[PDB]
Symmetry: C2
Subunit: 303 residues, 2 copies
């Protein structure tokens, strides 16, 4: 059921708007379990309620945020939560211009689950599924990505990350990404209405990390991909910025928006500034709003 | 196992070819072909007639090195000498231009040799299965050149059989190849691509869009340059389209040049008509098409 020019228009508008000016993506979709340690770390208990609380706070921050955040991904749960005044978390973000994202993380029930998701205000989906192996999750992605685009969703293709050297990690990422896109072509996936969520070729200063990241990236990632928001993963809010800055500085061809799709580097500080106490929204919305702008500048190199 | 040392080279050469709106001349016509050419100007096919015409081209003013950054050559020709016993090979080396040989098991041996002779880049052109073998051959040879310090001009394929049709095909055939080159770990930065142009009536606008689209869907931003082949197009159209493609409002991380033959020698060969009296005229039309296309490569070209 190949896309019609119209479906592309829609897809394109979205993927492009999730990075429109350097606006990265927020990883506010952690699992019931993950959120648990996150909140746990701050010397607090993991409970459904206390979630809607740290999430209502973030999505409530000044509207200026839509200058650093182009879209936010949510766990199933949050996509339905109502803020204090019974306001849908969904709409608190939509109104302010941010785009609704949904963790779709088996391709069974996806062409159905997505169809619904779109109706429920979601415009893009996240999902992460040896030569044999490498080709597997690839054809997989390819299908899942082809599915989202059928239900007006914008696939954020995530190529799984797998003690060696940078040069090593670089060769693997390259070898992988090549299979990812090759497969994706095989499945006639509108690259324009897509988005890549790769890892930073890391173990080595940010420049060296960005020089080995972009390189491997430009040798593999097609110009037609509107943007590539990185995943912080184990990088301090201060290193997920340094690196993403150098990346947007590395002296090489870079036809795609070199954005971010952070969670630990966008919440951490704003996560401590809460600690259960729901009156210090300032400290919270302070530590969150401080990183969204900063890492919005990493996506510009003006950092 | 390319060393950061040869990559250095492979690239310098890869880029020096497509520097500033500069393209490649394909004077590599194989005997039989070259005769078909001369035959159109009613000129007998002789080892000499060939040697002369091509002598005229390569003998054109050195300012020809502002439009032509590299010339390909056919076996025979790599060893012929101009009227004064001088070598086209070196006539071109000294004249700025880089010399390129046409290569088409024993390959890697030949290369090192053609490298010793002054050639710094070569060429070799070839169903789901089909395209795969093509892709992979084009990749073995690719790494064989870089092994022997040459810059592999990857040439894909396609059949004359609308626009969106030739496009969709081009993108497949092009993914097979850059994927191929990856499985074989080909230093993409020491490469060059000679794609066809994705081409119901069509304006350079479209013919260029359909094309650049497909190109930025498949060909990596690491490839330093895409030198389109004009096969079939008039010298004029090869230019309108190379210009068009160069102005297309799309992303283009790579130089979009020309690696023309018919499009560059066409007129320059008809004005000579095999009469050594017109060496003058000939060199004009060449120089003319030579600069003309460079402009198209800068998108800076105007038809009147």
């Amino acid at each position: 059921p190949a896309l019609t020019q119209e479906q592309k228009k829609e897809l394109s508008e979205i993927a492009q708007s999730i990075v429109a000016n350097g606006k990265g993506i927020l990883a506010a979709d952690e699992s019931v379990g993950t959120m648990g340690n996150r909140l746990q770390r701050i010397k607090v208990e993991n409970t459904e309620e206390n979630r809607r609380q740290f999430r209502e706070i973030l999505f409530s921050v000044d509207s200026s945020i839509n200058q650093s955040i182009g879209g936010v991904i949510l766990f199933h749960e949050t996509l339905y939560q109502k803020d204090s005044q019974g306001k849908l978390f969904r709409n608190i973000l939509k109104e302010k211009g941010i785009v609704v994202g949904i963790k779709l993380d088996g391709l069974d029930g996806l062409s159905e689950r997505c169809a619904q998701y779109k109706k429920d205000g979601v415009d893009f989906g996240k999902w992460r599924p040896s030569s044999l192996a490498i080709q597997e999750n690839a054809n997989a992605l390819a299908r899942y990505a082809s599915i989202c685009q059928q239900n007006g969703l914008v696939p954020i293709v995530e190529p799984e990350v797998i003690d060696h050297d940078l040069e090593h990690c670089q060769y693997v990422t390259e070898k992988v990404l090549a299979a990812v896109y090759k497969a994706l072509n095989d499945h006639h996936v509108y690259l324009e209405g897509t988005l890549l969520k790769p890892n930073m070729v890391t173990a080595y200063t940010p420049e060296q990390v960005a020089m080995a990241t972009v390189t491997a990236l430009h040798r593999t990632v097609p110009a037609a991909v509107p943007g590539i928001c990185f995943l912080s993963g184990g990088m301090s809010e201060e290193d997920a910025t340094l690196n993403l800055n150098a990346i947007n500085l590395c002296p090489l061809p870079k036809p795609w928006k070199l954005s971010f799709s952070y969670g630990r580097a966008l919440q951490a500080s704003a996560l401590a500034a809460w600690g259960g106490k729901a009156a210090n929204k300032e400290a919270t919305q302070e530590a969150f709003m401080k990183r969204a702008m900063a890492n919005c500048q990493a996506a510009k190199g003006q950092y």
